[PDB]
Amino acid sequence: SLDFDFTMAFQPIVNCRTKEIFGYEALVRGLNNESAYSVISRVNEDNRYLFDQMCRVKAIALAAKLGLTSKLSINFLPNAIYVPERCIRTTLEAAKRYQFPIENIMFEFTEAERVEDVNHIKRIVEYYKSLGFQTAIDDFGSGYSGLNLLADFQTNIVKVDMGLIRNIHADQVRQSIMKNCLKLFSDLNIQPLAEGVESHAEFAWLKAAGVELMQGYYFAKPGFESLPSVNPEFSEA
Amino acid sequence: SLDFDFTMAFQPIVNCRTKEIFGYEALVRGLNNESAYSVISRVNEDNRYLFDQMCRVKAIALAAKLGLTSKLSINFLPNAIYVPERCIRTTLEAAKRYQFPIENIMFEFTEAERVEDVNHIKRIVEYYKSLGFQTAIDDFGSGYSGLNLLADFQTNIVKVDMGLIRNIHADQVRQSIMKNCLKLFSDLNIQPLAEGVESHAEFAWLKAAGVELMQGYYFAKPGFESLPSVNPEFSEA
């Protein structure tokens, strides 16, 4: 209730090997399903802290109410807070109140539109890992979310940007990028997740290339205040 | 026609395989060897184009005056000139007047906060290639200069950011990043160039890993209005 209100949509992440849902990404929405950008547009510098806290409690509260028993992935605001130990208490308290294990919460980090801070994000990531949270680098291969992040700290998961996934079955350059990045992730013991999968052709190439966790319209669109079920076409095909 | 004046320093790029000097990067300086940042700090949106053009002509003219016979590498300003012949003619004319071959000029592209027009950088790169210029992605593995660029267009050279090079002989994560990136560059028929090499230990790992083109204080610092000679410690053969 920081001048405005909002809620969450949820989008499944699928394990294409086991054909089970690994979890859901929480995606901020307006009360009448207005887009995430229109909500985040209302966030200013005096909002960052309070807005980020509301996102986590809303996602946890909604996911618990909806009966989510797999992972809950929450986007971490790009700049926002410096100190990592203080006001995470409200996240820990919410997780306790809704009986949602910390180990089932993943935070997605996409650096910023800022310079070579990186040591800023690193200590946040390593502190969250120390409490039991899962961590992901988001939008890998776009913007400031790249190899510079990976060089200084490693998350549990790397979500590869949809720009690199698009039409990968037909794009030899994207094929070479992904094959070498998958070997990199394997060397670093990082689990890849392909984001923005829109067609069976992308899915099949990515699955053959070794990706298991995937997300995208091909599986299910984000669901307003709900947990969407997943497309049956991928599990048989 | 600019409010201020400046000149260039030059820093050699070495080929550790052929043991020859590949070329020199031109680095903008003030008339009294003031730093590049102090010069570029005076550039605003009403300056970007003209400043970028002056840098090119000054680098070409000085390199010619100093008798440069290898490649000349020139930085392209983030969000500089427009898509087509936006007076690249003045660059062609200067190269001709100073009898500097077009194929010996390389332009370095370092993106910084471009998200919208994707073919914007691509069309400049493909047009310059069509004129005979060499092209490089600069600072690969930092800022907005990452895998997203490589996916949609490929330059002749990729300069890997010094952040990825630093202490690589002792850094297992940076070794894996570089090993897998070197294989990617080879798959894309792109020549790698390791930037910011500061010690023999970094040089030795990079050479054993297959890197040929290198740049850094280990070889020579930039020389104000001069072409520095290269470190005798490696050049003894």
Ligand SMILES: Nc1nc2c(ncn2[C@@H]2O[C@@H]3COP(=O)(O)O[C@H]4[C@@H](O)[C@H](n5cnc6c(=O)[nH]c(N)nc65)O[C@@H]4COP(=O)(O)O[C@H]3[C@H]2O)c(=O)[nH]1
């Ligand atoms: N073209 C395409 N898009 C797909 C596909 N599958 C999922 N998406 C969309 O792509 C975005 C993925 O989330 P994001 O990359 O982190 O990009 C997000 C995220 O960076 C930001 N953000 C969203 N929710 C939150 C939040 O709760 N807290 C914070 N701090 N930031 C958020 O807003 C961005 C947009 O989120 P959305 O509008 O929901 O758009 C979502 C999602 O709806 C696909 O197959 N094709």
Ligand SMILES: Nc1nc2c(ncn2[C@@H]2O[C@@H]3COP(=O)(O)O[C@H]4[C@@H](O)[C@H](n5cnc6c(=O)[nH]c(N)nc65)O[C@@H]4COP(=O)(O)O[C@H]3[C@H]2O)c(=O)[nH]1
């Ligand atoms: N720590 C370390 N640094 C090394 C080493 N070897 C070279 N360098 C420094 O790192 C910078 C390399 O150039 P840059 O990455 O493109 O980064 C440059 C470039 O982006 C920008 N710039 C410089 N000259 C020009 C120009 O003529 N035109 C445009 N548009 N930008 C320029 O200014 C940036 C800084 O230029 P400089 O002050 O000359 O700093 C140079 C260079 O002096 C090393 O071994 N260790």
Ligand SMILES: [Ca+2]
């Ligand atoms: Ca995300």
Ligand SMILES: [Ca+2]
């Ligand atoms: Ca994302």
Ligand SMILES: [Ca+2]
């Ligand atoms: Ca450069």
Ligand SMILES: [Ca+2]
């Ligand atoms: Ca550079």
